Design a protein around this nucleic acid. Structure first.
Lengths: 22, 132, 82, 99, 82, 71, 213, 218, 129
RNA sequence: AGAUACCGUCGUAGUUCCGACCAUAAACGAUGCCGACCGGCGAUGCGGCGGCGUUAUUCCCAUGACCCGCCGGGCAGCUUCCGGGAAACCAAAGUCUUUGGGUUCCGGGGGGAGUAUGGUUGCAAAGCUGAAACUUAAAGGAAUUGACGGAAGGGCACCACC
RNA sequence: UAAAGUUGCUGCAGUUAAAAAGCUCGUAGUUGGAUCU
């Protein structure tokens, strides 16, 4: 996996966790 | 293709290196002398070495052959190089000398020589080739 | 190459160097006595002057500042000291 | 590992160089990294010179030329064979080919 | 070279470069030992004497063997002063 | 380079002490997380009760059943 | 010269050097050849100090003389300009000539046919004769060279500062070297000019060969 | 029978060179192993340090050669190291023995402290390097022995060093570089300029100059 | 900026001697440099040197005789007792047969053997061998 | 085959400017700053100094444009057995087991992971700081020989073509 | 604990193997030119 795409995936994961964790 | 291989060329080279005087002027003499003093198994091969012997000897009449180290070739070269005229090329009455080399001579205790002549210096300093 | 040695002269290799990089540093400048043809007295001017100096008895521009050595006016006879 | 000492560009002593678009693909390439060709072309091709010269209303018109500067990215310059890969030792030679 | 009892304990005493005073190694195959012939004072002929100069491979490599041999010959009377 | 001053002892000692934590073995020994995670808790041996016999497959290049026990 | 009136420069030698243009260097100056030049001309040509040239020639002659077996000195010329001169020098002084291509491994490959082990090496030009120069650094072989202003002095132990581009200059330089070696050995004498004259050492074009007969 | 090919070989065969030290003094290349066989051939002991197979991939499979590292030397101040690669192990070892004989260098030995008796250790600290392997030799007191890894220990014992401290840095697992680095450190013993070697050198006629006419008549 | 003019002088001498030069220029000169150079010269390691006096800070032209392997400085100037001298000698000198450690002691600037003779310690300036 | 892409026609935010925020890039010379020392050469940019000669100011000097050098910083280049390095390569990435000129930041097998968590900053996106359990014998660097390339350039056989 | 110069004060590294802050300024800290018998 391209490193920048893995970074984008981790960013999306963090955003989803921030949304779910209210 | 009529390129002669290293077998023919090298055997002819050794023969002319070794039996340079024993050679002849006609190809048919050359094959006979080659067959006299060489273990050449077959007629075709001895013919080919003889033929390149003729061609190499034809090349001899005008100059040396690179792979051959015969003493007679060295004698010929050293006789040709033994040429001298009656007047040396360095024996001339007037030698044009620039002022700077004149000063060099004068500081060398040779400014009293009257064999030289003043050649004027160059007008400018345009000696470099243009860049780019 | 065998520094400070008298056997091989090097006035020419020493005044070619940078003034600070010499064996003993020394300025590349000088003071000069200047006569103006219209004037009658000496004026000691620095070679690399930065001031538009005038004759001590007149109002004539002796020299003008430049990037380096100052530019003297015509006719003024200038001679270095020492 | 480093392939070239100059990194394939002429950027020495500056930070940023303005880009230009490749004439072949419209790719942004730095002006120093772009590969530049300056073509001088007769606007009339060699075969058409005779016809136009014969049909001219003047005498000895000397036909005008066309001055086009082309800037290539590395990919388009390689595909068009303007430049090509060289051996590791022949790479260092910056001398242009004879012309 | 020596021990307390006084005898010399080295296998051999290696040469030193006549210009740099550094040991010339056993496998310094670029080093040279050149003999310059002495010449009789009045007739200018070889009198059978010579002066030897050993130059190491490093000095020859940096191109300084020529100037070093010139300096040694000048200091040895072979090359005329000035 | 590194500092070489007669009055740099605090700097050198502190830098060494901070940089020792990037040593994996030193950090494992001195952080206390590994001792907490260790089932033996710093002991060389431990007594246990066998819960079941489990067969463990050897890793891919080899092929066997390693006969283990859950305790 | 050793400050010897017998070994000092003569007027005939200086005249020959000037006629052959030995003092004329190139427009480039190798930094290790600086001590051998006099001054740069207005056209960029460096003048070679002929006193220094004579000193270095005499030092080279002394180095050549201090080898009892003359065949142990090798005289090399890859360029066509100095082949005739080298052959004449070898004939005169008994040295061993290598005129033409110097095959690599001549000093280093003891199996080779033309393998030879000289005690001294003389070359016509360090640039053209760089192969024997480099090989001399493998067998402890000292080197004498005819060096122009821009010649590199690596592996050159005795450099003779001279014009080595002109045929007249190279021939005259080899002729003077042979003359001085013979004079120092005991053969011939300084009380009379040598019978050989430099034109015999010169390289001549084949067109000139045909014309002059 | 030995038929010398070089001038040095001819001079050695005719008993004109009285010792191997005369060859080392003038730093002449030794192109004939029979010279070393003549001078030291009764006391030299060769040890095959290693046989290492090296493979070159080709159109079909790997062409394999074997490289022999061999250490040679009498135990009284002479040591050499030779590496030869060949198709067969036996000829590789033969060539490596020849090359180790050709590369034999003298070893300078000194004293750690008080100078009673024969020299026993390196004259000073000397470092040798080969391809990221650095080997440092330090003088040691008499009776210490060679404090070193087995590979440098072999070469140091073969060189007549009785006691020596050793340091090593780098990839010493590569036996060839380790051996070459310790050989370099050993050969640097005679290149180090110590104040007892300050005495001005008295030049002697080289073997080619001394026995010139002998070679001329040949 | 430059600290430790002695370090600069010693590095210059070392670099010049490694190139095989006959003289080396040192600037600026100082009393410590002159004393260190005198210690080096008394043991035959450099030779004569000339102090060029300009009215700001002198220079030194040091004649090199190629007997020097390494002249180095030890920074900082650690205080050295007579006990620590053996450990410093083992660390710095290539042999117990030759080489010197230079100290500045209250009795002057001297090598380590002379400091043992006068039974004194001090601060290590550098070493040469 | 599918295209959600490459390609085409449009086209929103944006791209432009003003005022606030963000503080990240292969933000790179993947190379901290200051100082000393250690080769050669030809250029080039700025400043100064010196000098045949050529041009313009249509006249004296000066001043420009050239030409030949020198000195000082600067961007670089070529070269070199300085030396170094695993090598690529570097006149610094040299002056290193012959190890110490001064000083700042920073690395310690590969993953987990720049993740979790806490703190802090931000309107937000996110930035700074930043683990562990666990997993693993290699991951990696440079260079060599092959093989392959939807890379380039050649050569050959009427089992290729004309 | 040594081996580990793989924690490097002695004594390690940081172009490409892990690594020099994007870049400057800047207090503390550290380090500081010659010179006085």
């Amino acid at each position: 996996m391209r490193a920048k795409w893995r970074k984008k995936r981790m960013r999306r994961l963090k955003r989803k966790r921030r949304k779910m964790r209210q | 293709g009529r390129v002669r291989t290293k077998t023919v060329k090298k055997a002819a080279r050794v023969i002319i290196e070794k039996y340079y005087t024993r050679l002849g002027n006609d190809f048919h003499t050359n094959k006979r002398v080659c067959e006299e003093i060489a273990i050449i198994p077959s007629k075709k091969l001895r013919n080919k070495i003889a033929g390149y012997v003729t061609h190499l000897m034809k090349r001899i009449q005008r100059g040396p052959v690179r792979g051959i180290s015969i003493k007679l070739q060295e004698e010929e070269r050293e006789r040709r190089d033994n040429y001298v005229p009656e007047v040396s090329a360095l024996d001339q009455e007037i030698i044009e000398v620039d002022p700077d080399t004149k000063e060099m001579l004068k500081l060398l205790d040779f400014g009293s020589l009257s064999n030289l002549q003043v050649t004027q210096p160059t007008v400018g300093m345009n000696f470099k080739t243009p860049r780019g | 190459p065998l520094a400070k040695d008298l056997l091989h002269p090097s006035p020419e290799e020493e005044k070619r160097k940078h003034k600070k990089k010499r064996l003993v540093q020394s300025p590349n400048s000088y003071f000069m006595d200047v006569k103006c043809p219209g004037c009658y007295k000496i004026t000691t001017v620095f070679s690399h002057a930065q001031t538009v100096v005038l004759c001590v008895g007149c109002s004539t521009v002796l020299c003008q500042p430049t990037g380096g050595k100052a530019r003297l006016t015509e006719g003024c006879s200038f001679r270095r000291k020492q | 590992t480093k392939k070239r000492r100059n990194n394939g560009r002429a950027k020495k002593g500056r930070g940023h160089v303005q880009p230009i678009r490749c004439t072949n693909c419209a790719r942004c390439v730095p002006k120093d990294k772009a590969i530049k060709k300056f073509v001088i072309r007769n606007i009339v091709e060699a075969a058409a010179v005779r016809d136009i010269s014969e049909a001219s209303v003047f005498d000895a018109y000397v036909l005008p030329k066309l001055y086009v500067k082309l800037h290539y990215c590395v990919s388009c310059v390689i595909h068009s064979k303007v430049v090509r890969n060289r051996s590791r030792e022949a790479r260092k030679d910056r001398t242009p080919p004879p012309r | 070279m020596q021990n307390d009892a006084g005898e010399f304990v080295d296998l051999y005493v290696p040469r030193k470069c006549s210009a740099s005073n550094r040991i010339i190694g056993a496998k310094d195959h670029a080093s040279i030992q050149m003999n310059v012939a002495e010449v009789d004072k009045v007739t200018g002929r070889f009198n059978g004497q010579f002066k030897t100069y050993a130059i190491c491979g490093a000095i020859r490599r940096m191109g300084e063997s020529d100037d070093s041999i010139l300096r040694l010959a000048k200091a040895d009377g072979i090359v005329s002063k000035n | 380079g590194k500092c070489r001053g007669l009055r740099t002892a605090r700097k050198l000692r502190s830098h060494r002490r901070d940089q020792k934590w990037h040593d994996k073995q030193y950090k494992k020994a001195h952080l206390g997380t590994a001792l907490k995670a260790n089932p033996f808790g710093g002991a060389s041996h431990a007594k246990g009760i066998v819960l079941e016999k489990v067969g463990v497959e050897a890793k891919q290049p080899n092929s066997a059943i390693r006969k283990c026990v859950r305790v | 010269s050793g400050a010897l009136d017998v070994l000092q420069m003569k007027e005939e030698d200086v005249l020959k050097f000037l006629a052959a243009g030995t003092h004329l260097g190139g427009t480039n100056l190798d930094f290790q050849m600086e001590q051998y030049i006099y001054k740069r001309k207005s056209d960029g040509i460096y003048i070679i100090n002929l006193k220094r040239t004579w000193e270095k020639l005499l030092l080279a002659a002394r180095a050549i003389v201090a080898i009892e077996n003359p065949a142990d000195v090798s005289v090399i010329s890859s360029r066509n300009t100095g082949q005739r001169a080298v052959l004449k020098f070898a004939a005169a002084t008994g040295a061993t000539p290598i005129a033409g291509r110097f095959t690599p491994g001549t000093f280093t490959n003891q199996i080779q046919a033309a393998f030879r082990e000289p005690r001294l090496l003389v070359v016509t030009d360090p640039r053209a004769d760089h192969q024997p120069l480099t090989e001399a650094s493998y067998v402890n072989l000292p080197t004498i060279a005819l060096c122009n202003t821009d010649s590199p002095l690596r592996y050159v132990d005795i450099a003779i500062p001279c014009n080595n581009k002109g045929a007249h200059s190279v021939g005259l330089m080899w002729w003077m070297l042979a003359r001085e070696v013979l004079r120092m050995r005991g053969t011939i004498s300084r009380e009379h000019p040598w019978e050989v004259m430099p034109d015999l050492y010169f390289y001549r074009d084949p067109e000139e060969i045909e014309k002059e007969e | 029978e030995w038929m010398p090919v070089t001038k040095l070989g001819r001079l050695v065969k005719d008993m004109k060179i009285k010792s191997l030290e005369e060859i080392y003094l003038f730093s002449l290349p030794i192109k004939e192993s029979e010279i070393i066989d003549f001078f030291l051939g009764a006391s030299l002991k060769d040890e095959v340090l290693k046989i290492m197979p090296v493979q070159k991939q080709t159109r079909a499979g790997q062409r394999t050669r074997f490289k022999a590292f061999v250490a040679i030397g009498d135990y009284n101040g002479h040591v050499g190291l030779g590496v030869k690669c060949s198709k067969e192990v036996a000829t590789a070892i033969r060539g490596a023995i020849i090359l180790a004989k050709l590369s034999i260098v003298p070893v300078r030995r000194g004293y750690w402290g008080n100078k009673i008796g024969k020299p026993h250790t390196v004259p000073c600290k000397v470092t040798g390097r080969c391809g990221s392997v650095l080997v440092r030799l330090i003088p040691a007191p008499r009776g210490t022995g060679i404090v070193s890894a087995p590979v440098p220990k072999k070469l140091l014992m073969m060189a007549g060093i009785d006691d020596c401290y050793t340091s090593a840095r780098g990839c010493t697992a590569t036996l060839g570089n380790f051996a070459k680095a310790t050989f370099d450190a050993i050969s640097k013993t005679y290149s180090y300029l110590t104040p007892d070697l300050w005495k001005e050198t008295v030049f002697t006629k080289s073997p080619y100059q001394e026995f010139t006419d002998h070679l001329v008549k040949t | 900026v430059r600290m430790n003019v002695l370090a600069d002088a010693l590095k210059s001498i070392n670099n010049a001697e490694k190139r095989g030069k006959r003289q080396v220029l040192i600037r600026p000169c100082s009393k410590v440099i002159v004393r260190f150079l005198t210690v080096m010269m008394k043991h035959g390691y450099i030779g004569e040197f000339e102090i060029i006096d300009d009215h700001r800070a002198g220079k030194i032209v040091v004649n090199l005789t190629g007997r020097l392997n390494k002249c180095g400085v030890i920074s900082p100037r650690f205080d050295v007792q007579l006990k620590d001298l053996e450990k410093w000698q083992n660390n710095l000198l290539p042999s117990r047969q030759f080489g010197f450690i230079v100290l500045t002691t209250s009795a002057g600037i001297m090598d380590h053997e002379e400091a043992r003779r006068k039974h004194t310690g001090g601060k290590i300036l550098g070493f040469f061998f």
